Amino acid sequence: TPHFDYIASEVSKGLANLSLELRKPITFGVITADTLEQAIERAGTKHGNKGWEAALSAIEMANLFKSLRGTGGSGSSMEIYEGKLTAEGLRFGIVASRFNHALVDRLVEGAIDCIVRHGGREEDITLVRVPGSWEIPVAAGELARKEDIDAVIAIGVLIR
Amino acid sequence: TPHFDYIASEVSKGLANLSLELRKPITFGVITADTLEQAIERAGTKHGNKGWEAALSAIEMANLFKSLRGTGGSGSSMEIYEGKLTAEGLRFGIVASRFNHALVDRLVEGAIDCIVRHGGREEDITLVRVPGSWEIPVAAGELARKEDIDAVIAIGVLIR
Amino acid sequence: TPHFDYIASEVSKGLANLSLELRKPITFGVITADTLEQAIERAGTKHGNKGWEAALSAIEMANLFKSLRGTGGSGSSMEIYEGKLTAEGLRFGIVASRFNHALVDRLVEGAIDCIVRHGGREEDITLVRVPGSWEIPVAAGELARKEDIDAVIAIGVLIR
Amino acid sequence: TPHFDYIASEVSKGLANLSLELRKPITFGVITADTLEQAIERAGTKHGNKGWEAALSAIEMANLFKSLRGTGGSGSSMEIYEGKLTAEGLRFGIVASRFNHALVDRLVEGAIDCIVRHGGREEDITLVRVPGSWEIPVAAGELARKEDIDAVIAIGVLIR
Amino acid sequence: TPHFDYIASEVSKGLANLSLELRKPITFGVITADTLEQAIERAGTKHGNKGWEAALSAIEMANLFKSLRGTGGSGSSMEIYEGKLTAEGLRFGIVASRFNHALVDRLVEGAIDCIVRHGGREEDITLVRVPGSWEIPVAAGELARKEDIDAVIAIGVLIR
Amino acid sequence: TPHFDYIASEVSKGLANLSLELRKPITFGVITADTLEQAIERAGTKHGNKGWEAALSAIEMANLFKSLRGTGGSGSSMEIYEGKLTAEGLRFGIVASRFNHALVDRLVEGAIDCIVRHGGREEDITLVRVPGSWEIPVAAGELARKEDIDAVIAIGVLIR
Amino acid sequence: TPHFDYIASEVSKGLANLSLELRKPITFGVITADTLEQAIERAGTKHGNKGWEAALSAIEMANLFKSLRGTGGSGSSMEIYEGKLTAEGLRFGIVASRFNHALVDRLVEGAIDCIVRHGGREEDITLVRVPGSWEIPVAAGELARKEDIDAVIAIGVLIR
Amino acid sequence: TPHFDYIASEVSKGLANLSLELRKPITFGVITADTLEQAIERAGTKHGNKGWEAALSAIEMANLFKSLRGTGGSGSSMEIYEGKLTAEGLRFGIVASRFNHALVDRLVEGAIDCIVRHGGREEDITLVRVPGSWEIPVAAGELARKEDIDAVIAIGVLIR
Amino acid sequence: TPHFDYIASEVSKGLANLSLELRKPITFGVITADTLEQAIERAGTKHGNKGWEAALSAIEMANLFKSLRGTGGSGSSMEIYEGKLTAEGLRFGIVASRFNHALVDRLVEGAIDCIVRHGGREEDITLVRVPGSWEIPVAAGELARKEDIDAVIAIGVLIR
Amino acid sequence: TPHFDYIASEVSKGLANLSLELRKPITFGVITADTLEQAIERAGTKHGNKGWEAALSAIEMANLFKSLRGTGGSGSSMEIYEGKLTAEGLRFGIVASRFNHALVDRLVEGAIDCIVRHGGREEDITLVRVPGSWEIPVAAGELARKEDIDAVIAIGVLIR
Amino acid sequence: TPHFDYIASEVSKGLANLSLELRKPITFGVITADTLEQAIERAGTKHGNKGWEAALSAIEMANLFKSLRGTGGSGSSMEIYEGKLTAEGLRFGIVASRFNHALVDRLVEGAIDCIVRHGGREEDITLVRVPGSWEIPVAAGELARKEDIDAVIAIGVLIR
Amino acid sequence: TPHFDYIASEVSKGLANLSLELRKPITFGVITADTLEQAIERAGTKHGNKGWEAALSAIEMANLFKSLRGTGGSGSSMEIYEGKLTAEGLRFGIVASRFNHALVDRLVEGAIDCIVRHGGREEDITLVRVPGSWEIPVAAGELARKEDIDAVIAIGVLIR
């Protein structure tokens, strides 16, 4: 049914505009699959875990923004900016939906595992749960406005 | 005819932007079906009632936002935010269209039934009717700006 | 040709955003047909007149907004807001395109007929003509900003 | 390739939003064809010249806006606003792309021919050239902000 | 999978809006291919290098904007504005993604080669790397706000 | 039936010879279609209005003949003669048939609209109606012989 | 559509009768093609330029008529009359239509090139432009009646 | 017909031998297409302009030869020779054929545009025209022997 | 049989090298057809006369070379060299083969006709006949070395 | 096998260049057939003898060159040079290969028969035999450099 | 397209003649493939690296020529000349094109790797870059004429 | 692949030109086969040995050239020149490639066997080895210039 298309378009558009308005990194960890088999593939099976990948992107972006707003350094040569993959000292927020929870809970486990084994603390993670993917952008807007949050990770599953 | 696509795109886009601008929950209770049979399925028959589901999402989001803006509590561990399913003390607004009223009136009945049996009062419900789905976003904007409204529910039916 | 899609997307999007920004009703009276036969059907023939329907929606919305911004009344029960279908005292603006004028002039006749027989005056109607559908949103923006206009009706014909 | 779709969507969307923000007429003179033969048809051959048509729309819109912001006149009857097709005293800007220049230069010739034979002067035309269609909206934004420009004409060719 | 469409739509839309808001040139150097073979074709092989083309567009736009904001000159004739292809004295920023790095690094080489052989210095190039195409718009927003950057080049590869 | 061919041949031949004998411009505004759908296309719909086009040709020819019979001017270079598109001061005659009046009246409206918006007066238009296309040439001969008529426009519809 | 046949028949017939009545050479430089590809072939491509050929015929005919009306000479043998291909001292008029101008302007360039490189002057060429092929015969009649014109060249493009 | 093969073989062979004998750069800007559509593609349309590309090659080769015959410099490392893309101070000759002039004139425009916008002067360009591609090599031999010419550009169109 | 290919390759190659060695124009007037019908087409019938075309090329090249070796003139602008089509004062040589003489004699007639009617004298034409196409290059070498010959025309017919 | 092509190309090319370098006639009497039957046809059977034809060409060319280098004569009219078919006083050389000698010896007989019956002497014929067609050009070079040889005849047979 | 054939023929022919004229080794390291897949196969993948092979041939030829021009030695037996594969003391030049640089840079790496690991120095390698394969022969001619160069390596990629 | 054609064309062309320039016999002993089976057939199997055949041709040519440059003798009759098949006193050079050495070494054995059994000495044979067929012509040029070499034999194998 066409119900799939309109929800997917608005969730992706909402998160993108929000990141530019607040000038803070927000990572897209939402699965958009045509079949149930395709979704299981990406939820901790032969095609990996999308929750793990989204967390890794957030860590890099947080370090990159710390570098851009610093001194930068270097001189007499091309300046190159890049982000490390160390999570020590960073604080993260996660927004997850409850629909298709059999798959979503696998993605949330991956995101937490990535942060901890790269040097982060569970005490620095804030987790917010919403009833559906439609409510992710408005909930993400509340976390992104907090001063002590470095990046936000959005997780959900949509099946056509 | 392509008339279906343009109306559906603008209604979904309008409600999404409105929720982010006013920072208030708005739930998507609009059916978008390809055939008449598919619409009857979701209007109180073998595939459930979409009006009931939209009301349940609104109740949860209202409680969640009450929790985020409070003290929060907890410490020395991962903070988790979630919303209960009790409607005592909450105030709701509903916007419904008149086209395909044979189906829409079934969705409005479900939304009211959900609120009352979860502990709400009919005195706390405000209902606004508009001639069509195109007029839902502008009407929803008037309710969302009232200080004594906690969440808004949008209901409509579109058939290709 | 794909020329049809881009014009249709921008006209619908422009009018929708304009209504939310100015918080005034704007009705969508634009035909979007795949064949010439489908267009004649909706221009005063076996499938009705879209110009008549758009005017009827404008009258209802104007009365509804008068009711929301008033006292409202009622008490100890569910508040219900709805609009009458009387046009006495209301002032309307119309924006119409010149392309496919053989069909557009039938839609403009229907809109004027609806307003007059529901109790309106021709003296209270302002009509603006533009060369094409692409120019409708910018022209509609000038009328919507006038203080003595209650609603705007947009009329046009697009054929793939 | 899908490269065609994304460029076409952004160019049309950019020009539409720009016209509403600055409240000035901007005309869409961009060809969007599926085949090379379809493009030659509309570049000064059996299906006319799109550059000529875009210039004619600009002249009408400029006169219409002069009329709306004037006294208006009339009374005791329905007010009708329309634009003449005389270009005496008007000042125009043109933005043209360089890709597919074998066709684009035919469209620019048509636009200049239309303005001159309707009573305009070549001294009142400002022409800006950009490397591609993607750069049209940003260049059009510089011309539209000048106080002595009445309307802007955008010209380009895209082939799937 | 539909994952390709939503990412491509948001990246193109984000860059377009950013250029209009900041009124600075931003060039679209992102490949959007249906097959791996189509991508290799445009990454330094029989169909050229898209990184080279994007850099050439940036140089022209930078010179054009220098000309518009200057005196302009000329008189008693049609004013024509155009940009040279000399890069002496200009300063450029580049944002590149890490996904499909086997192809992306070919595009970055082309962009640097174009700038140097047209008269630019490597000391005037700032390069920022991001984990994926989704993060390009937010990173591009940081460079575009610097006062000593004349234009920004965005590079990435997406394969359906 | 072959009835279509003989009428069409004689009407076109009659008007052509008449223009050469009297040395005055006469424009061919007669539709010759194979199907009813083809005729509606050219009578104010997706393929334009033939009545508008015929009037535009008459205006140009009238100005051109005023220029040829004047001084001409210029020297030491190639002489070029062309006609403007201003209708101020010109006087026009129109001959229209009554068969297929549902379509013919759309063409007559277009011709009058073109003349007025290019600067002409309705007081300077003479309209003659004949029962059929066969009678157009003899009626056109009476108007063309008047001293105060600058050009004649012939309008009709023939369907095989 | 049969519209092509009637216009083509009248234009060819008009020019032929005009040449016999005034006893002056008139050359037929009008393309009559069934497809767009056939027209491009004869407008300066693999099948030559019809504008060049028409000018060459005019030069020969002008010299031939100068020879017939002279002494003739010769005796006691068969008299043979023929025309040279030198354009020194001759004066030419050209009538060209504006429809399908993308092709017509190529034919006019060829005609001027032929005259100049055979020894003629641009100062001796008079160029008249008309809105369409239907108006060519009446315009050609004005030039042919001038005493200082030796031959007339008619140029146009018609596509079925 | 086999006429295409023999002309193409001799033109390419002639230019190649000439460049080696005189030890001066000569660039191959001749289109060799199987169909008319393929030729239009490369004459300023979706596949670019071959005249522009040939001029760019000439500029690079001229700078490279200036570098080889100079000091060279560098030491204790691999010597690398390359040419810049600045045209300041260079002098160019162009040889163009007249057959298929509708396409050839587009290629000549591109070559001149490239030279001027890279810093060259029109005063430093010498243009020679020949009746056909067969005559290009002998004409190119006269320009290449002049002492004040740095490179030669050959332009033509051949269609099988 | 393959006999056709080897003769055609050597005749074309021989004439091309000869023109470069002696630096004198030589024109290729040899028909290379696959069928007898194709040859008759080009020997004075619906596809013209190749002997006429070859003579016209020789006249232009002779005038061009007279211009290059002269003063040239012009200044402060782009120098353009081109050849007139006047044959007064020029001297020509012709080499023709005897095989397929039924067709060759038609080509020789055309070449002589072209020269005389453009202003040349028959007294200035030298005609040499050889038994076959294989012997054309060696015979052409004797004429090209004479000081009082301006250009050479080669004529022959080969059929596969 | 492709062995046939390379030998045939080099033998024909070698003889052609040799004739131009030494400025002496050399005739091509080599059969190039696809099948054995085709070769027997041309070796003294229903399609004639190629050895006879090559000798006849040599006789004509020898007389022609005697005429060109003489006085020439004639005046006040077109000069025509041609060769007789008398062999009295001429001296000839023949180079023949040994491969396929069953056919080659028939060709050598024909060449000698032609010379004798046209008035030549066997005492004036020099015959050189080589092992194969590849060795013909080098052997022909030794004969052509002798002062008392007027023309050379090359004979061989190649079968694919 | 046939463009591939003519470029390939001239590049191979140019290098071959150059080696014989200067009597110095030149190696053919140019890939000529029908498909992109075939080219990747030979650019450092399952079918090896053509750049490595060309360098190995150059080393052997350089040693062989050193041996031929020396004493030679040996006696009373068959003399055999052969080249070692040691690169100590030799000096090499490389000419490489820029088109299809994604593949060409792999070939240049292989050539340098071969020379160094066989005992050569990077200080003894001269590298020249040209815009395309057409320019390789003229650039190779400049290196081959230097006294301190032992062999030249030509590298390029052409794809049909 | 087309790689086969270009190498084969240049090797055959190089050897042919070399023989004419130095006026010394050079024999073509290179196999050009389409399949591996065809090559084994000609390398000492059912279709003979090409190395043996090439040596036999060299012996004959060496004796023939000794006869031409001698007295010649004979008189009062047709002079006939031919070569014996005795190798006593003659000196030979051989150039062989290393690619496909499994087959090439069979051809070299045949060439040596032919010379010895016809009366030659192994002491009079000089053998030069090159890495590939491309290097044969340049190596053959060094041997052919030695005064004490009577003929050269070229051996190689190419497989499509």
Residue numbers in the entry:
A (entry chain C), B (entry chain D), C (entry chain E), D (entry chain A), E (entry chain B), F (entry chain AA), ...: 3 to 162
From the paper:
As such, we found that a circularly permuted variant of a cage-forming enzyme, Aquifex aeolicus lumazine synthase, cpAaLS, assembles into a variety of hollow spherical and cylindrical structures in response to changes in ionic strength. Cryogenic electron microscopy revealed that these structures are composed entirely of pentameric subunits, and the dramatic cage-to-tube transformation is attributed to the moderately hindered 3-fold symmetry interaction and the imparted torsion angle of the building blocks, where both mechanisms are mediated by an α-helix domain that is untethered from the native position by circular permutation. While the wild-type protein, AaLS-wt, self-assembles into a ∼ 16 nm dodecahedral structure composed of 60 identical monomers,35 the negatively supercharged variants AaLS-neg and AaLS-13 adopt expanded 360- and 720-mer assemblies, respectively, constructed entirely from pentameric capsomers. Moreover, a circularly permuted variant of AaLS, cpAaLS(119), forms not only ∼24 nm and ∼28 nm expanded spherical cages, but also straight ∼24 nm-wide tubes of variable length. We previously designed two circularly permuted variants of AaLS and confirmed that their morphologies depend on the positions of the newly generated N- and C-termini. The native terminal amino acids were connected via an octapeptide linker using genetic fusion and new sequence termini were introduced either between residues 84 and 85 or 119 and 120, yielding cpAaLS(84) or cpAaLS(119), respectively.
The cpAaLS(84) assembly resembles the AaLS-wt cage, where each pentamer interacts with five neighboring subunits in a dodecahedral arrangement. The atomic model of the cpAaLS(84) cage revealed that all the constituent pentamers interact with each other in the same manner as in the AaLS-wt assembly. The 2-fold symmetry interface consists of a hydrophobic patch (L8, L141, and W137) surrounded by a hydrogen bond (H41) and ionic interactions (e.g., R40 and E5) while an α-helix region (120–131) forms 3-fold symmetric hydrophobic clusters (I121 and I125) in the cage interior. Irrespective of the tested buffer conditions, cpAaLS(84) did not exhibit substantial fluorescent changes up to 110 °C, indicating little protein unfolding.
